[PDB]
């Protein structure tokens, strides 16, 4: 049972941070990029290396210690950080045509963020159930052909960074009562990125009963994916490029019973 | 039916939560969620698609708590496509974008559709080509004539069976469906990019202009869906439909009627 | 006419429900809903399209219950393109997207148009090329001059016959049509993808800024439509227009006038 | 200077209704609505476009009923491009999409613009290339310098003559035009599809934030437009601009001023 | 500062009107508004763009009528890109769309950005490739590391000099800029079509959720912009950035503040 909101100067706080992307980082110079994408000969032989698989980013942020009172997340400001970096079309890129500039980052993107009072809850779904996922990732276990559409065995929490591959996992809509999530997959082999920034846009996190995420143990959970597309180098090889995401969350003290 | 007052009290409401898996053709035991590779007839007259090359409408009849005159009234819907991120597998037997590039993602013609009603969805048959010979095990427009390519009012059916009603033959009958709410988008084009949004913050109200939602005949709720996301292109250039499951959560309340 | 009060009571309203079939040219007995393959003239002066290569406006005059004064007033419209899923037939004599690929779907230039009025839709002629020779059996701008390529006020007509008024020759006349509500979108481009939405939950209100809808002269309602969805490309590369039927449901009420 | 009350009574309102034809260059007696085929200079220094290759702004000065202090205040606008369906002529000396295909439609760069004011539209010159030699018979930015490629405040003009002001070197001057309302969209790209909407149900309000419309000096209303729809490609591959006429309906009321 | 009442009366309001020119690199005396043709490095480690190949942020600091505590408060903005129609010049040393066709227009990657603030726009550095050698005459993220490719909080700056801060290195810092309102859109893709709207009827309100707009420290208003419209392709296939100027009209009112 959720009771009244506490008022007074002491009763509000603000969390501000950036989540870095976890795209695979194939060497010591390539933070923010995946390994070049290679293609299996068959579905049966699909076995991507770890450094080729973008993962969900997650941060657990401690809040001022309370105590029952709980911090309630009320509003969010968020945007992708470094959108202009994608204007570097002069660095080992495959040219658009002879003498032209380098191709920009483009193609499949996934832009996702969530705010919750506990870890984001995940459901596994596989493009191909016979994919061998690599050591160091957490992926759907006991995959069957049903895993290609819905196998309810594949439940997890986003409770580790650099671990849950984006392609295996989505927010579980049957759970996440204490999280608000938002995402868009834009597919297509060379779809153009469209990235907006502004410090004037706010998302309200309150449900239809006027209640936002309530932070269990005085911890706020922030999650993101910002796969912007693929970068094409001069050989034609392509690799995922991600960007960091900014979060500002405003919270207020809420009394609750039981 | 004269519709009267809504019942109140803790026990006056119930909730249905459910996922509908796609029915894309499933051409072998490893390919749930996909169709058979598409092949093209040399003439309109010789068009004879095999069953496993034809996506069909998904449907579920959900029994509700027994009432009797009270009827369960569907008031709100939350819904979304499950597994959107699986379309980021561009390393599994796909045709490369170009020399050394990543695999092409699922793209091209999509149909995204869902409906909620208190009885089976009512269908009207329309055929691209009236001479198409539909296969055994499908339910299709019978006694087709050349008028069936635009409108033949003989072709009426109920979506009353799973893996049966091919998507390309049937649409919701706008002359009926008074006790169902339906929503769908066909986005065509040989390589249109998929755009799939997920969030747990969106709700659709199913009440009509008079404040009445679908009323469940025999305490049965009917959910229907199609989510053809596009086509996957394998290394040989062959293309097959790929579909994804759909989540439904519906809130219902008891309503007295005559 | 001075428009006075709306009549009330159970008898004061009526409903019109119907479908208008497309008139795309119907080049043979198997190709209802298609045009003849498009041929290209060598010069502007030699452009002489055959009748079966020219989509035309559809129109229906629906008689209403006899009233006499009182007039039937059109208040709301539900409308929908019927058979949108038929465009997923990419296996019937289409040109392949690439070697071993599925057939290309209908795509390219579309015109989607509908109007509701109390009299025939008023048309203004505008010609792409004033030297086009239009075929016997069609009604087209007469005495064309070079000014007909931009605006020649001699070209006035009424949409008063089916299978007759070519889409490419005529538009709604914005200088007239006070007693009609019309809505249209031309989406050009050689392969723009169709985007077709269906739902039974959308209504368009036909009342003007003074709260008055179309008033039906002689107790006749006029419905008009074009739904050229794009072009179908067959195995040879030849292209032909494909159209679909449009559903209409109009609510009308009795209105006194003087 | 000082705006006082609006007049009322049956006599206090008037309406202006007209169309502006496009001025695309009209390269011969058969090609009203089209420009000359577009050629490309070898260098910026040699850019010397023909008069008939340059589309121009259209303008109409419309005398209003004599008033005298009272002034006509323009309050609402309805506007529409006339002849949108003419772009469905893909059978008249067009370059085929591919072998045996239909002709390509008009597509590529478009500029759609309209304004309503109580005096001539005020213009600011901006040049793509300051060394362009603009031809005899056009009115263009004089004493051009390299700064004219970004902003040269010397280039001020009034849109006070037809077939004179090339579209490509003039825009509405945002530093002036207090007594005009203007609206325009440049949609660029080598083959972007045209999207043209028509309806007689849409009104634009011309009142500013103080509820004051353009005030017609000397009882003249000024209407201006450009509707370059894209380029038409003939069989040789050569391209020329295609424009259409624009309809205006403006409602005005008498306003007292001191 | 406590924000108190707005002052009223005929002299309590003022207006600022100006245009910011684009700073795209200006590679010779005839190419104001354009960058140098884009060249591509062989490897990430050899990326070394010349200054005239790098578009930069534009900024203007405008002095306001001297006050005095009262501060000018920015309330509304009208803005638009100036010269949108110039992009219809497809007849001047462009690569043809196809044989005998017209010249390709400006297209591909665009960044359209503007901000209004009562102090310099605050910037955060992010690099596509941390080994890029940025040229003399530009102000760029210093002591770059591989972390700079995603987030290195050392890269803080103020947009306080024109023709200096390269667009590709810098973005508005969302952790600061309390006294600025900023808006931008990056539209990527190798040949995305520009869509540019002009009108004198659109206004943006600069007030925050508490009804307070940017407060002008020292009676100065800061305006910033980028309008990289895309790339022009010349007959050889070489591509270069093309930018346009941006108009700003800002309405301000006098606001009393404490301490």
CSV table of N, CA and C in Angstrom, one decimal, chain A residues 16-18 20-21 27-33 77 79 81-106 190-200 202 231 233-234 239 241-244 246 248 250, chain E residues 38-44 47 49 53-54 57 95 104 109-111 113 124 126-132 134 146-147 149-151 153 167-172 174-175 177 180-190 192 209 228 231 233 236-239 241:
chain,number,residue,atom,x,y,z
A,16,UNK,N,21.9,11.9,-11.3
A,16,UNK,CA,22.4,12.3,-12.6
A,16,UNK,C,23.6,11.4,-12.9
A,17,UNK,N,23.6,10.8,-14.1
A,17,UNK,CA,24.7,10.0,-14.6
A,17,UNK,C,24.7,9.6,-16.1
A,18,UNK,N,25.7,9.0,-16.5
A,18,UNK,CA,25.8,8.5,-17.9
A,18,UNK,C,26.1,7.0,-17.8
A,20,UNK,N,27.7,4.2,-20.1
A,20,UNK,CA,28.5,3.9,-21.3
A,20,UNK,C,27.9,2.7,-22.0
A,21,UNK,N,28.1,2.6,-23.4
A,21,UNK,CA,27.6,1.5,-24.2
A,21,UNK,C,28.6,0.3,-24.0
A,27,UNK,N,39.4,-4.4,-29.3
A,27,UNK,CA,40.7,-4.2,-28.8
A,27,UNK,C,40.9,-3.0,-28.0
A,28,UNK,N,42.1,-2.6,-27.6
A,28,UNK,CA,42.3,-1.6,-26.6
A,28,UNK,C,42.1,-0.2,-27.2
A,29,UNK,N,41.8,-0.1,-28.5
A,29,UNK,CA,41.6,1.2,-29.1
A,29,UNK,C,40.1,1.3,-29.6
A,30,UNK,N,39.3,0.3,-29.4
A,30,UNK,CA,38.0,0.3,-30.0
A,30,UNK,C,36.8,0.2,-29.0
A,31,UNK,N,36.9,0.9,-27.9
A,31,UNK,CA,35.8,1.1,-27.0
A,31,UNK,C,34.7,1.8,-27.7
A,32,UNK,N,33.5,1.2,-27.6
A,32,UNK,CA,32.3,1.8,-28.3
A,32,UNK,C,31.9,1.2,-29.6
A,33,UNK,N,32.8,0.3,-30.0
A,33,UNK,CA,32.6,-0.5,-31.3
A,33,UNK,C,32.6,-2.0,-31.0
A,77,UNK,N,14.9,12.9,-17.5
A,77,UNK,CA,15.5,13.5,-18.7
A,77,UNK,C,16.6,12.6,-19.2
A,79,UNK,N,19.1,11.6,-22.9
A,79,UNK,CA,19.5,11.7,-24.3
A,79,UNK,C,20.8,11.0,-24.6
A,81,UNK,N,24.6,10.8,-25.8
A,81,UNK,CA,25.7,11.7,-25.6
A,81,UNK,C,26.7,11.4,-26.7
A,82,UNK,N,27.0,12.5,-27.5
A,82,UNK,CA,28.0,12.5,-28.5
A,82,UNK,C,27.5,12.2,-29.9
A,83,UNK,N,26.3,12.6,-30.2
A,83,UNK,CA,25.6,12.4,-31.4
A,83,UNK,C,26.5,12.9,-32.6
A,84,UNK,N,27.1,14.1,-32.4
A,84,UNK,CA,27.9,14.7,-33.4
A,84,UNK,C,29.1,13.9,-33.8
A,85,UNK,N,29.6,12.9,-33.0
A,85,UNK,CA,30.8,12.1,-33.3
A,85,UNK,C,30.6,11.3,-34.6
A,86,UNK,N,29.3,11.1,-34.9
A,86,UNK,CA,29.0,10.3,-36.2
A,86,UNK,C,29.2,11.2,-37.4
A,87,UNK,N,29.6,12.4,-37.3
A,87,UNK,CA,30.0,13.2,-38.4
A,87,UNK,C,31.4,13.0,-38.9
A,88,UNK,N,32.2,12.2,-38.1
A,88,UNK,CA,33.5,11.8,-38.6
A,88,UNK,C,33.4,10.8,-39.7
A,89,UNK,N,33.4,11.3,-40.9
A,89,UNK,CA,33.4,10.4,-42.1
A,89,UNK,C,34.7,10.5,-42.8
A,90,UNK,N,35.8,10.7,-42.1
A,90,UNK,CA,37.1,10.9,-42.7
A,90,UNK,C,38.1,9.9,-42.1
A,91,UNK,N,37.6,8.9,-41.3
A,91,UNK,CA,38.5,8.0,-40.6
A,91,UNK,C,38.3,6.5,-41.0
A,92,UNK,N,39.1,6.0,-41.9
A,92,UNK,CA,39.1,4.6,-42.3
A,92,UNK,C,37.7,4.1,-42.7
A,93,UNK,N,36.9,4.9,-43.4
A,93,UNK,CA,35.6,4.5,-43.8
A,93,UNK,C,35.6,4.1,-45.3
A,94,UNK,N,34.7,3.2,-45.6
A,94,UNK,CA,34.4,2.9,-47.0
A,94,UNK,C,33.7,4.1,-47.7
A,95,UNK,N,34.2,4.5,-48.8
A,95,UNK,CA,33.7,5.7,-49.5
A,95,UNK,C,32.4,5.4,-50.1
A,96,UNK,N,31.5,6.4,-50.1
A,96,UNK,CA,30.2,6.3,-50.7
A,96,UNK,C,30.2,5.9,-52.2
A,97,UNK,N,31.3,6.4,-52.8
A,97,UNK,CA,31.5,6.1,-54.3
A,97,UNK,C,32.9,6.7,-54.5
A,98,UNK,N,33.5,6.6,-55.7
A,98,UNK,CA,34.8,7.0,-56.0
A,98,UNK,C,35.1,8.5,-55.7
A,99,UNK,N,36.1,8.8,-54.8
A,99,UNK,CA,36.5,10.1,-54.4
A,99,UNK,C,35.6,10.7,-53.3
A,100,UNK,N,34.5,10.0,-52.9
A,100,UNK,CA,33.5,10.5,-52.0
A,100,UNK,C,34.0,10.4,-50.6
A,101,UNK,N,33.2,11.0,-49.7
A,101,UNK,CA,33.4,10.9,-48.2
A,101,UNK,C,33.2,9.5,-47.7
A,102,UNK,N,33.6,9.2,-46.5
A,102,UNK,CA,33.3,7.9,-45.9
A,102,UNK,C,31.9,7.7,-45.6
A,103,UNK,N,31.4,6.5,-45.6
A,103,UNK,CA,30.0,6.2,-45.2
A,103,UNK,C,29.9,6.5,-43.7
A,104,UNK,N,28.7,7.0,-43.3
A,104,UNK,CA,28.5,7.2,-41.9
A,104,UNK,C,28.0,6.0,-41.2
A,105,UNK,N,27.9,6.0,-39.9
A,105,UNK,CA,27.2,4.9,-39.1
A,105,UNK,C,25.7,4.9,-39.5
A,106,UNK,N,25.2,3.7,-39.9
A,106,UNK,CA,23.8,3.6,-40.4
A,106,UNK,C,23.5,2.1,-40.3
A,190,UNK,N,20.6,-0.2,-44.2
A,190,UNK,CA,21.3,1.1,-44.1
A,190,UNK,C,20.4,2.2,-43.7
A,191,UNK,N,19.5,2.0,-42.8
A,191,UNK,CA,18.6,3.0,-42.3
A,191,UNK,C,19.3,4.2,-41.7
A,192,UNK,N,18.9,5.5,-42.0
A,192,UNK,CA,19.6,6.6,-41.4
A,192,UNK,C,19.3,6.8,-39.9
A,193,UNK,N,20.4,7.1,-39.1
A,193,UNK,CA,20.1,7.5,-37.7
A,193,UNK,C,19.4,8.8,-37.6
A,194,UNK,N,18.5,9.0,-36.6
A,194,UNK,CA,17.9,10.2,-36.3
A,194,UNK,C,18.0,10.4,-34.8
A,195,UNK,N,18.8,11.3,-34.4
A,195,UNK,CA,19.1,11.5,-33.0
A,195,UNK,C,18.8,12.9,-32.5
A,196,UNK,N,17.8,13.1,-31.6
A,196,UNK,CA,17.5,14.4,-31.1
A,196,UNK,C,18.1,14.6,-29.7
A,197,UNK,N,18.5,15.8,-29.5
A,197,UNK,CA,19.0,16.2,-28.2
A,197,UNK,C,18.3,17.5,-27.7
A,198,UNK,N,18.0,17.6,-26.5
A,198,UNK,CA,17.5,18.8,-25.9
A,198,UNK,C,17.4,18.7,-24.4
A,199,UNK,N,17.7,19.8,-23.7
A,199,UNK,CA,17.5,19.8,-22.2
A,199,UNK,C,16.1,20.3,-21.8
A,200,UNK,N,15.1,20.3,-22.7
A,200,UNK,CA,13.8,20.8,-22.4
A,200,UNK,C,12.7,19.7,-22.3
A,202,UNK,N,11.0,16.2,-20.8
A,202,UNK,CA,10.9,15.4,-19.6
A,202,UNK,C,9.9,14.3,-19.8
A,231,UNK,N,29.3,0.9,-38.5
A,231,UNK,CA,30.3,1.6,-39.2
A,231,UNK,C,31.0,0.6,-40.2
A,233,UNK,N,34.2,0.0,-42.5
A,233,UNK,CA,35.6,0.4,-42.8
A,233,UNK,C,36.0,0.2,-44.2
A,234,UNK,N,37.2,0.6,-44.6
A,234,UNK,CA,37.6,0.6,-46.0
A,234,UNK,C,37.5,-0.8,-46.7
A,239,UNK,N,30.9,-3.0,-38.3
A,239,UNK,CA,30.9,-3.3,-36.8
A,239,UNK,C,29.9,-2.3,-36.1
A,241,UNK,N,28.4,0.4,-33.7
A,241,UNK,CA,28.9,1.6,-32.9
A,241,UNK,C,27.8,2.0,-32.0
A,242,UNK,N,28.2,2.1,-30.7
A,242,UNK,CA,27.3,2.6,-29.7
A,242,UNK,C,27.7,4.0,-29.1
A,243,UNK,N,26.8,4.6,-28.3
A,243,UNK,CA,27.0,5.8,-27.6
A,243,UNK,C,26.5,5.7,-26.2
A,244,UNK,N,27.0,6.6,-25.4
A,244,UNK,CA,26.6,6.7,-24.0
A,244,UNK,C,25.2,7.4,-23.9
A,246,UNK,N,22.7,9.7,-21.1
A,246,UNK,CA,22.6,10.5,-19.9
A,246,UNK,C,21.3,10.2,-19.3
A,248,UNK,N,18.8,11.9,-16.0
A,248,UNK,CA,18.6,12.7,-14.8
A,248,UNK,C,17.2,12.3,-14.3
A,250,UNK,N,14.5,12.6,-11.0
A,250,UNK,CA,14.0,13.3,-9.8
A,250,UNK,C,13.2,12.3,-9.0
E,38,UNK,N,36.2,16.2,-48.4
E,38,UNK,CA,36.5,15.2,-47.4
E,38,UNK,C,37.5,14.2,-47.9
E,39,UNK,N,38.6,14.0,-47.2
E,39,UNK,CA,39.6,12.9,-47.5
E,39,UNK,C,39.4,11.9,-46.4
E,40,UNK,N,39.8,10.6,-46.7
E,40,UNK,CA,39.6,9.5,-45.8
E,40,UNK,C,40.9,9.0,-45.4
E,41,UNK,N,41.2,8.9,-44.1
E,41,UNK,CA,42.5,8.3,-43.6
E,41,UNK,C,42.5,6.8,-43.9
E,42,UNK,N,43.7,6.2,-44.1
E,42,UNK,CA,43.9,4.8,-44.3
E,42,UNK,C,43.6,3.9,-43.0
E,43,UNK,N,43.8,4.5,-41.9
E,43,UNK,CA,43.6,3.8,-40.6
E,43,UNK,C,43.1,4.7,-39.6
E,44,UNK,N,42.6,4.2,-38.5
E,44,UNK,CA,42.2,5.1,-37.4
E,44,UNK,C,43.4,5.9,-36.8
E,47,UNK,N,44.2,9.2,-38.8
E,47,UNK,CA,43.2,10.2,-39.0
E,47,UNK,C,43.8,11.5,-38.6
E,49,UNK,N,42.5,15.2,-39.8
E,49,UNK,CA,41.8,16.1,-40.7
E,49,UNK,C,42.3,17.6,-40.6
E,53,UNK,N,38.5,21.3,-43.2
E,53,UNK,CA,37.6,20.2,-43.4
E,53,UNK,C,36.7,19.9,-42.3
E,54,UNK,N,36.8,20.7,-41.2
E,54,UNK,CA,36.0,20.5,-40.0
E,54,UNK,C,35.0,21.6,-39.8
E,57,UNK,N,31.1,24.8,-34.4
E,57,UNK,CA,30.0,25.5,-33.8
E,57,UNK,C,30.1,27.0,-34.0
E,95,UNK,N,27.9,16.3,-59.5
E,95,UNK,CA,27.9,15.0,-60.1
E,95,UNK,C,26.4,14.7,-60.4
E,104,UNK,N,23.3,16.2,-58.4
E,104,UNK,CA,22.8,15.8,-57.1
E,104,UNK,C,22.8,17.0,-56.2
E,109,UNK,N,24.5,13.3,-44.2
E,109,UNK,CA,24.5,13.7,-42.8
E,109,UNK,C,24.3,15.2,-42.6
E,110,UNK,N,23.3,15.5,-41.7
E,110,UNK,CA,23.0,16.9,-41.3
E,110,UNK,C,23.0,17.0,-39.8
E,111,UNK,N,23.3,18.2,-39.3
E,111,UNK,CA,23.2,18.5,-37.9
E,111,UNK,C,22.6,19.9,-37.8
E,113,UNK,N,21.2,22.6,-35.1
E,113,UNK,CA,21.3,22.8,-33.7
E,113,UNK,C,21.2,24.3,-33.4
E,124,UNK,N,30.5,19.0,-23.8
E,124,UNK,CA,31.1,17.8,-23.4
E,124,UNK,C,31.7,17.2,-24.7
E,126,UNK,N,33.1,14.2,-27.0
E,126,UNK,CA,33.0,12.8,-27.4
E,126,UNK,C,33.6,12.6,-28.8
E,127,UNK,N,34.5,11.6,-28.9
E,127,UNK,CA,35.3,11.4,-30.1
E,127,UNK,C,34.9,10.1,-30.8
E,128,UNK,N,34.7,10.2,-32.1
E,128,UNK,CA,34.4,9.0,-32.9
E,128,UNK,C,35.6,8.0,-32.8
E,129,UNK,N,36.8,8.6,-32.9
E,129,UNK,CA,38.1,7.8,-32.8
E,129,UNK,C,39.1,8.7,-32.0
E,130,UNK,N,39.5,8.2,-30.9
E,130,UNK,CA,40.3,8.9,-29.9
E,130,UNK,C,41.8,9.2,-30.5
E,131,UNK,N,42.2,8.5,-31.5
E,131,UNK,CA,43.5,8.7,-32.1
E,131,UNK,C,43.5,9.8,-33.2
E,132,UNK,N,42.3,10.3,-33.6
E,132,UNK,CA,42.3,11.4,-34.5
E,132,UNK,C,43.2,12.5,-34.0
E,134,UNK,N,43.6,16.2,-34.2
E,134,UNK,CA,42.8,17.4,-34.5
E,134,UNK,C,43.8,18.5,-34.8
E,146,UNK,N,41.1,6.1,-25.0
E,146,UNK,CA,40.1,5.2,-25.6
E,146,UNK,C,38.7,5.4,-24.9
E,147,UNK,N,38.7,5.8,-23.6
E,147,UNK,CA,37.4,6.1,-23.0
E,147,UNK,C,36.7,7.3,-23.6
E,149,UNK,N,36.1,7.9,-26.6
E,149,UNK,CA,35.2,7.3,-27.6
E,149,UNK,C,33.7,7.1,-27.1
E,150,UNK,N,33.6,7.0,-25.7
E,150,UNK,CA,32.2,6.8,-25.1
E,150,UNK,C,31.9,7.9,-24.1
E,151,UNK,N,32.8,8.1,-23.1
E,151,UNK,CA,32.6,9.2,-22.1
E,151,UNK,C,33.9,9.4,-21.3
E,153,UNK,N,34.9,12.3,-18.7
E,153,UNK,CA,34.4,13.6,-18.1
E,153,UNK,C,35.5,14.7,-18.0
E,167,UNK,N,32.4,20.5,-34.7
E,167,UNK,CA,31.1,19.9,-34.4
E,167,UNK,C,31.3,18.5,-34.0
E,168,UNK,N,32.1,17.7,-34.7
E,168,UNK,CA,32.3,16.3,-34.5
E,168,UNK,C,32.9,15.9,-33.1
E,169,UNK,N,33.6,16.8,-32.5
E,169,UNK,CA,34.2,16.6,-31.2
E,169,UNK,C,33.3,16.9,-30.0
E,170,UNK,N,32.3,17.7,-30.2
E,170,UNK,CA,31.6,18.3,-29.0
E,170,UNK,C,30.1,18.3,-29.1
E,171,UNK,N,29.5,18.1,-28.0
E,171,UNK,CA,28.0,18.2,-27.9
E,171,UNK,C,27.7,19.0,-26.6
E,172,UNK,N,26.5,19.6,-26.6
E,172,UNK,CA,26.0,20.2,-25.3
E,172,UNK,C,26.2,19.2,-24.2
E,174,UNK,N,24.9,17.7,-21.0
E,174,UNK,CA,23.5,17.6,-20.4
E,174,UNK,C,23.6,17.7,-18.8
E,175,UNK,N,24.8,17.5,-18.3
E,175,UNK,CA,25.0,17.6,-16.8
E,175,UNK,C,25.2,19.0,-16.4
E,177,UNK,N,24.5,23.4,-18.2
E,177,UNK,CA,23.5,24.1,-19.1
E,177,UNK,C,22.1,24.4,-18.4
E,180,UNK,N,20.7,27.6,-20.0
E,180,UNK,CA,20.6,27.6,-21.5
E,180,UNK,C,19.5,26.6,-21.9
E,181,UNK,N,18.8,26.9,-23.0
E,181,UNK,CA,17.9,25.9,-23.6
E,181,UNK,C,18.5,25.5,-24.9
E,182,UNK,N,18.7,24.3,-25.2
E,182,UNK,CA,19.3,23.8,-26.4
E,182,UNK,C,18.5,22.7,-27.1
E,183,UNK,N,18.6,22.7,-28.5
E,183,UNK,CA,17.8,21.8,-29.3
E,183,UNK,C,18.6,21.4,-30.5
E,184,UNK,N,18.8,20.1,-30.8
E,184,UNK,CA,19.5,19.6,-31.9
E,184,UNK,C,19.0,18.3,-32.5
E,185,UNK,N,19.2,18.1,-33.8
E,185,UNK,CA,18.9,16.9,-34.4
E,185,UNK,C,20.1,16.5,-35.4
E,186,UNK,N,20.6,15.3,-35.2
E,186,UNK,CA,21.6,14.7,-36.1
E,186,UNK,C,20.8,13.7,-36.9
E,187,UNK,N,20.7,13.9,-38.2
E,187,UNK,CA,20.1,13.0,-39.2
E,187,UNK,C,21.3,12.4,-40.0
E,188,UNK,N,21.5,11.1,-39.9
E,188,UNK,CA,22.7,10.5,-40.4
E,188,UNK,C,22.3,9.9,-41.8
E,189,UNK,N,23.1,9.0,-42.3
E,189,UNK,CA,22.9,8.3,-43.5
E,189,UNK,C,23.6,9.0,-44.7
E,190,UNK,N,24.1,8.2,-45.6
E,190,UNK,CA,25.0,8.6,-46.6
E,190,UNK,C,24.3,9.5,-47.7
E,192,UNK,N,20.7,10.8,-47.0
E,192,UNK,CA,19.4,11.2,-46.5
E,192,UNK,C,19.0,12.6,-47.0
E,209,UNK,N,10.1,24.6,-16.4
E,209,UNK,CA,8.9,24.2,-15.8
E,209,UNK,C,8.4,25.1,-14.7
E,228,UNK,N,24.7,22.3,-40.5
E,228,UNK,CA,25.3,21.5,-41.5
E,228,UNK,C,24.1,20.8,-42.3
E,231,UNK,N,26.1,17.2,-47.5
E,231,UNK,CA,27.3,17.3,-48.4
E,231,UNK,C,26.9,17.6,-49.8
E,233,UNK,N,28.2,17.2,-53.7
E,233,UNK,CA,29.1,16.3,-54.5
E,233,UNK,C,29.4,17.0,-55.8
E,236,UNK,N,33.7,15.4,-59.8
E,236,UNK,CA,34.7,14.4,-59.6
E,236,UNK,C,34.2,13.3,-58.6
E,237,UNK,N,33.1,13.5,-57.9
E,237,UNK,CA,32.7,12.6,-56.8
E,237,UNK,C,33.1,13.1,-55.4
E,238,UNK,N,34.0,14.1,-55.4
E,238,UNK,CA,34.4,14.6,-54.1
E,238,UNK,C,33.3,15.3,-53.4
E,239,UNK,N,33.2,15.2,-52.1
E,239,UNK,CA,32.1,15.7,-51.3
E,239,UNK,C,32.6,16.6,-50.2
E,241,UNK,N,31.1,19.4,-47.0
E,241,UNK,CA,30.0,19.9,-46.2
E,241,UNK,C,29.5,21.3,-46.7
